[PDB]
Amino acid sequence: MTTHGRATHYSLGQGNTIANGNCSMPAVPADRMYVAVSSPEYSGAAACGTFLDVTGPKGTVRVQVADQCHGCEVGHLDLSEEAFRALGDFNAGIIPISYVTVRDPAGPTVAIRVKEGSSRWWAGLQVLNAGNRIDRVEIQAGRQWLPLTRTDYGYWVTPSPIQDGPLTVKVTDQYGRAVVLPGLRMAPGEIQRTASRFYPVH
């Protein structure tokens, strides 16, 4: 459904390679098109990684959900300065908008980043380029799949110690589509590439 509301602007700045915004993105988007959303819409970070098509006075742009705006009511987006300028007059401070969450946004293959400080005792995993909301992230333990816990900062974490070796992870999106990612290394901070996608390229 389309949400009708308003936008203000802010900036994460140029950022870093560790954690940008409440979603802890590996980078600020190169095009600087990102948005912080209300706490309900952030949904305990379940909205992290998703995209919104936002229409304002000047037209329509796409922004990555990057962050949480605690003071934004539902329907109020805190856009990047760049996204704001593309849609309206910067000095207006606030502009009327309408927006939708993009289904299957065009994107690269799924990637995985292990959190700094992770080990066999405790680890966080971040799922990059899923495109849509992720419902479950599980690590193989023999015949079973052990569920990781969704944090409110864009990672999924181990409830209990895991093995001292290669990791197989299954990620299931909100539409029930799953990818299985084998051979993942306990390599904190590194973005590990895969060949896997939730949906074909168009």
Ligand X SMILES: OC[C@H]1O[C@@H](O[C@H]2[C@H](O)[C@@H](O)[C@H](O[C@H]3[C@H](O)[C@@H](O)[C@H](O[C@H]4[C@H](O)[C@@H](O)[C@H](O[C@H]5[C@H](O)[C@@H](O)[C@H](O)O[C@@H]5CO)O[C@@H]4CO)O[C@@H]3CO)O[C@@H]2CO)[C@H](O)[C@@H](O)[C@@H]1O
What residues make contact with its own copies under the rule CB under 8 A? Answer: 10-13, 15-16, 18-21, 24, 116-117, 119, 121, 188-189
Task: Give the shortest CB-105-to-its own copies separation in angstroms.
Answer: 24
Closest residue (Cβ) to ligand X? Answer: 122
Q: Give whichever of 121 and 175 is closer to ligand X, judged by the CB atom.
A: 121
What is the rounded distance in angstroms from the CA atom of residue 43 to the CA atom of residue 92?
Answer: 29
Run of H or E including 86: helix 81-87
Choose among ligand X, its own copies, none what residue 16 binds, the Cβ cut-off being 5 to 8 Å by kind.
Answer: its own copies
Q: What are the residues binding ligand X (CB under 6 A)?
A: 12, 19, 21-22, 24, 67-68, 70, 115-117, 121-122, 153
> Structure tokens of 155?
């990672």
Kindly tell me which of 21 and 88 has the beta carbon lying closer to ligand X.
21
Distance, in Å, from the CA atom of 166 to the CA atom of 182, rounded to the nearest integer, reads 8
What is the residue type of 186? Answer: M
* Nearest Cα residue to 128 out of 196, 34, 188: 196
147 class by beta-carbon count within 10 Å (0-12 exposed, 13-18 middle, 19+ buried): middle
For ligand X, which is the closer residue by CB, 19 or 167?
A: 19
Residue 11: which of its own copies, ligand X, none does it interact with, CB under 5 to 8 A by kind?
its own copies
The neighbour count for residue 190, using CB atoms within 10 Å, is: 12
Q: How far is the CB of 2 from its own copies (least distance, A)?
A: 28
Looking at beta carbons only, is 115 or 198 nearer to ligand X?
Answer: 115
Considering the complex, state which of residue 89 and residue 190 has its C-beta at the smaller distance from its own copies.
190
CB of 139 to its own copies, least distance (A): 18
Give the HSE-up count for residue 35: Cα atoms under 13 Å, Cβ half-sphere: 31
